Design the sequence.
């Protein structure tokens, strides 16, 4: 969309209605007359447009009103309220922009931010943008967290996030203009190659793919149309549902062969009865003919009873000869039906062993996308974020995704090698207690009005805890932490001296010999300018290949590549890197997924701040002190980079409203 | 509102493949063995019918009699009268048959003769005698 009104789309806002957010900040406008609503909607969309049309410089309130023109530039408090709502909640002036109004001389309030991943960094910049004192505590020796980039010489390869899923409404679009990143489209053509080493024929690659998509849609039918969502008091997963749908297609194949061959018998026995009437009729014509010969033998002139006997037997014999002929057309008709029916048999199998193997690759691809075995995904809810998918081509970053965070970290107080170990929040403030990663003896104490936790969901899940909360987190939050899923997904970077693959194909598959190993190195990426091939490990394979040395892993990759490209066409790689995200103690997984028995409501639970009890009994209810951000706190855009960033912007607006006040609700 | 084309799912079947851990594998061997059951029932009635097919070798060809083409006449010879009273005794009211025996009386003047010569050939008593047989 375009106009002021692609501004609303590119900001993930309806252009022609107010959101629950805005109803909360502008309750006068939403309960007001429809015409003031349309005024506000235009003012919002127009300011969003001005920011989007140039996101490398701050959009001040009075640069804004300079460009809104009448009747819309008449109410200057409505324009000042709108601009301030947007600025506060990160819809404008977020990311890396040039600042017109330089910072307040003196800060207000102090926030500690656990983790300097993208969600951490994006809040930290917004808070420091708002006047606060901000400090980030980061266990690793580098920023970006699960945006990890490998760099040796000229080889560059993301071990973490790698793809931008479409710029249609993606906040990373704004960041792309702000920070130069070489965004290069991904050609979606993916040739599959079986374990033998040779391509799937287009006849099959298209059969199975269509069958995969039809099987998926079939589970959706089971879920939303037959309420197949519980089995034995436990919630149904996507994997169980796919397996039930597969079994019922196998059942229907056998049901078809049954009633087909049961039509051959119903007609093969209708034949049996017709031959039995034709033996017994031929034996009766054998015997009448004898009687007619004998009666014909009595030579004439005879008396009339003996003439009757010749006439009679002749009529009787032609009557049975007529009857035997009519049972001969009928024998013919049935003899052709059986030739027809037997030459038109139905399908012998639902899927052959070669077919199911290629279908497993499409399941490995899906375990790859959701970073978890299909047996763990909730059937009802695993795709609940699909309605908010961005538009356009999925892209990669030729210079490494690390450039985004590293760019956001500029200007910010970041303590690296600082591992938070305990979080203390009380009615009067908070202290975070961290240690030094190099030597765990060197202990640090940080005091603050608020803590922003962006600990990955797998760190929060860790038992025994890597981080202790004092007082402990309430059960409504720890229960969300157990119910949610934290998946796993690993990469093998293969660094070669020369390109030996098809340069015009960005990616190509490898079909597994078994279901159990469908994700073991089932896919290869070629996106870098240089000779670098990435191999993915998805599904149940991902957590098992972390108990196997790099050399054995690189070995299997070479073998697979040798079969696909020929044993002499693939040299030993110059440099190799194998990721282990479940092992990584600052991640303990790759990203979240909607587990069976979870829902999208658990992601809202993860986002709610925590408010401690009063220090003195009878004291008034305190302010919230512990806030949460990260990919597992944004229900509509989880498990991604854009969703981390968006949640950082969310909490920064929420912390500022709590500690700096929101003067745009009047 | 309806499942994808080429996909079969019924609320009925789905319960049956989920009643227990192997109720899936059960229902699919019940139909594997029902399918063998019917296949050997075919190759068995296909071998019965190959034998019955053989007994009918050469058909009924040595036994056919050439048809006689005879123009249909109107006057009733004493011979044709006596053939008729005997066909009545044998065929009751199967006019077609009776007309085929006599050979040159068609089916209507069979009807006419049940009536004109009903008195003199005692046709009533004849039919009763045929009736008890």
Sequence:
């Amino acid at each position: 969309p375009s106009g002021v009104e692609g501004a609303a789309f590119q900001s993930r806002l309806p252009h022609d209605r107010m959101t629950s957010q805005e109803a909360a900040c502008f309750p006068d406008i939403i309960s007001g007359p429809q015409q003031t609503q349309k005024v506000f909607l235009f003012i919002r969309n127009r300011t969003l447009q001005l920011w989007l049309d140039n996101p490398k410089i701050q959009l001040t309130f009075e640069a804004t009103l300079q460009q809104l023109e009448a009747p819309y530039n008449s109410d200057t408090v409505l324009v000042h309220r709108v601009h301030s709502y947007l600025e506060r909640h990160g819809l404008i002036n977020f990311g890396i922009y040039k600042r017109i109004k330089p910072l307040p001389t003196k800060k207000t309030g102090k926030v500690i931010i656990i983790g300097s991943g993208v969600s951490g960094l994006a809040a930290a910049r917004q808070l420091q943008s708002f006047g606060m004192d901000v400090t980030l505590l980061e266990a690793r020796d580098r920023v970006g967290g699960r945006v990890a980039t490998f760099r040796k010489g000229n080889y560059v390869a993301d071990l973490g996030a790698m793809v931008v899923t479409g710029l249609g409404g993606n906040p990373m679009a704004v960041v792309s203009k702000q920070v130069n990143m070489e965004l290069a489209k991904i050609k979606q053509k993916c040739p599959l190659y079986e374990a033998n080493g040779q391509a799937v024929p287009k006849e099959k690659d298209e059969m199975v793919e269509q069958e995969f998509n039809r099987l998926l849609e079939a589970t959706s039918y089971l879920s939303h149309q037959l309420d197949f969502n519980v089995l034995n008091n436990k919630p149904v997963s996507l994997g169980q549902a796919l397996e039930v749908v597969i079994q019922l297609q196998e059942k229907h194949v056998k049901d078809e062969q049954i009633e087909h061959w049961k039509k051959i018998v119903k007609t093969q026995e209708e034949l049996k009865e017709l031959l039995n009437k034709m033996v017994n009729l031929k034996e009766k014509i054998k015997e009448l003919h004898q009687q007619y010969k004998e009666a014909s033998e009595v030579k004439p002139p005879r008396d009339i009873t003996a003439e009757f006997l010749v006439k009679s037997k002749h009529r009787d014999l032609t009557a049975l000869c007529k009857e035997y002929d009519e049972l001969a057309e009928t024998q013919g008709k049935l003899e052709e039906k059986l030739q027809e029916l037997e030459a038109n048999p139905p399908s012998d199998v639902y899927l052959s062993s070669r077919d199911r193997q290629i279908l497993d690759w499409h399941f490995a691809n899906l375990e790859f996308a959701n970073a978890t075995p299909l047996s763990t995904l909730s059937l009802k809810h695993w795709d609940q974020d699909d309605d908010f998918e961005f538009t356009g081509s999925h892209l990669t970053v030729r210079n490494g995704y690390s450039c985004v965070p590293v760019a956001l970290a500029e200007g910010l107080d970041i303590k690296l090698n600082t591992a938070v170990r305990q979080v203390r929040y009380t009615a009067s403030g908070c202290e975070v207690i961290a240690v030094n990663t190099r030597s765990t003896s060197q202990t640090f104490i940080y005091k603050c009005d608020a803590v922003l936790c962006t600990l990955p969901l797998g760190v929060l899940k860790q038992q025994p805890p890597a981080v202790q909360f004092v007082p402990p987190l309430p059960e409504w939050k720890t229960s969300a932490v157990q119910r949610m899923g934290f998946g796993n997904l690993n990469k093998v970077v293969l660094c070669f001296d020369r390109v030996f693959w098809d340069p015009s194909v960005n990616l190509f598959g490898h079909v597994g010999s078994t279901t159990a190993s469908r994700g073991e190195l089932f896919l290869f990426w070629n996106l870098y300018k240089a000779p670098i091939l990435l191999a993915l490990v998805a599904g149940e394979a991902a957590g098992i290949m972390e108990n196997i040395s790099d050399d054995v892993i690189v070995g299997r990759c070479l073998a697979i590549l040798k079969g696909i490209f020929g044993s002499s066409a693939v040299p030993q790689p110059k440099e190799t890197v194998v990721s282990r995200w479940r092992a990584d103690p600052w991640a303990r997984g790759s990203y979240s997924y909607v587990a069976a028995g979870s829902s999208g409501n658990d992601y809202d639970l993860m986002a709610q701040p925590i408010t401690p009890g009063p220090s003195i009994p009878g004291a008034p209810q305190p302010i919230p002190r512990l806030f949460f951000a990260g990919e597992h706190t944004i229900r509509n855009y989880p498990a991604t980079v854009h969703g981390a960033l968006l949640s950082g912007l969310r909490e920064a607006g929420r912390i500022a409203d709590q500690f700096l006040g929101a003067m745009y609700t009047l | 509102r309806k499942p994808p084309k080429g996909m079969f799912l019924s609320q009925e079947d789905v319960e049956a493949v989920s009643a227990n851990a192997t109720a899936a594998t059960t229902v699919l061997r019940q139909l594997d063995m029902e399918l063998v059951s019917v296949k050997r029932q075919i190759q068995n009635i296909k071998q019965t019918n190959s034998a019955l097919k053989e007994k009918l070798d050469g058909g009924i060809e040595p036994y056919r009699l050439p048809e006689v083409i005879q123009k249909c006449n109107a006057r009733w010879t004493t011979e044709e009268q006596l053939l008729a009273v005997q066909a009545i005794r044998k065929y009751g009211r199967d006019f077609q048959a009776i007309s085929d025996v006599i050979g040159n009386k068609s089916v209507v003047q069979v009807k006419n003769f049940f009536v004109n010569y009903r008195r003199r050939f005692n046709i009533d008593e004849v039919l009763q005698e045929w009736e008890a047989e």
In short: The radius of gyration of chain A is 37 Å.
